[PDB]
Design an enzyme around this catalytic site. Sequence first.
Site, PDB file in Angstrom:
ATOM      1  N   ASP A 203      52.723  56.991  12.083  1.00  0.00           N
ATOM      2  CA  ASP A 203      51.550  57.424  11.336  1.00  0.00           C
ATOM      3  C   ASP A 203      50.928  56.212  10.657  1.00  0.00           C
ATOM      4  O   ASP A 203      50.999  55.103  11.193  1.00  0.00           O
ATOM      5  CB  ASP A 203      51.905  58.508  10.316  1.00  0.00           C
ATOM      6  CG  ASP A 203      50.745  59.455  10.045  1.00  0.00           C
ATOM      7  OD1 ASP A 203      49.766  59.031   9.394  1.00  0.00           O
ATOM      8  OD2 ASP A 203      50.806  60.618  10.494  1.00  0.00           O
ATOM      9  N   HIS A 226      48.719  54.337  12.610  1.00  0.00           N
ATOM     10  CA  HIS A 226      47.385  54.876  12.407  1.00  0.00           C
ATOM     11  C   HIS A 226      46.525  53.968  11.539  1.00  0.00           C
ATOM     12  O   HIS A 226      45.433  54.371  11.128  1.00  0.00           O
ATOM     13  CB  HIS A 226      47.467  56.275  11.792  1.00  0.00           C
ATOM     14  CG  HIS A 226      48.135  57.286  12.675  1.00  0.00           C
ATOM     15  ND1 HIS A 226      48.131  58.636  12.396  1.00  0.00           N
ATOM     16  CD2 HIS A 226      48.827  57.143  13.830  1.00  0.00           C
ATOM     17  CE1 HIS A 226      48.792  59.281  13.340  1.00  0.00           C
ATOM     18  NE2 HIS A 226      49.225  58.398  14.222  1.00  0.00           N
TER      19      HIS A 226
END
Length: 369
Positions: A203, A226
Amino acid sequence: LRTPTTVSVSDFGAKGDGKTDDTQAFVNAWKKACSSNGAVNLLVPKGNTYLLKSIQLTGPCNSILTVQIFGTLSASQKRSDYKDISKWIMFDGVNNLSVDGGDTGVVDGNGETWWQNSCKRNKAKPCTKAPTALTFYNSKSLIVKNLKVRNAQQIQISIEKCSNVQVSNVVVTAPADSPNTDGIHITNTQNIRVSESIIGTGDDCISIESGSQNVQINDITCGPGHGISIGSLGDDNSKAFVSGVTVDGAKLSGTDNGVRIKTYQGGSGTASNIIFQNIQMDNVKNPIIIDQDYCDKSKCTTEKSAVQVKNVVYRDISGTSASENAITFNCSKNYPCQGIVLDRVNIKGGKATCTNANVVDKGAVLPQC
């Protein structure tokens, strides 16, 4: 220097074979080191693996504590072994704390079994909170350095309600498709520097949440991940406040976002004084993105309130976009983005989309709104 006082988990029955539960040994060693006076090393010996259930290391302590995580900490995979299902290892209220991995220590969450039971990975499953591997909570004058955190159950490292923090030379790693494995999560923390670190996780490499002020991110590599993101801000109709963030010197490679600000419809408050400079994008989706179209329900209403985003500088950003849009400014209509500056930005491979954004171009900027 000084003659070091050392409290070793060895002294309290920790076997260090990765199969015996050594949790109580760590509890008792922490009692001894925390209650001692003066400078104390709490030693996790190199070359051993210590299986641990959830554990809370609570201060304040009489000692100035250096936790030397030189061996490997291995998380229980039994869900019933977690007092708080959101927390594995948690330091709570410990001031003047230093955590030193000595470039050998590893904090291993054994997260794969949690990941396959995640709803993002199996939609026949319910969405559940999984433990943060390593949490620092309510700490002043905190140092975390020379440590590796891998395969967290969910969030890898979280720094919450902390003040005056230095994180340096850490490695955070988890597979690109592991769910919600935020690398370094910073929330309600002021005066923090994260420097000279490497994050490749499932993430956000770094996520900065509400209450965060004076955040410095220097010389980090991100990928997979991310990206480096401020947010989410304003979820659950919350008032958000973020101020004074500088990312200076970063290389993002193959990330789902580059530098991102993400806020929710219905939120309130402000995110201001943000600088992303000296950033290298290597095949990055959404290299630059501010996105305020988010809502936290399955059926979103017309937005009444928004987090106001002002004073965001993108400077000396270079590289290649893997997205159709290299630059995306989707800002709120009632609270348009203000004082967005693009200064020597050159991202090839993508176009720029700008809505409700007051942008200013300084020097060579590509692409332009």
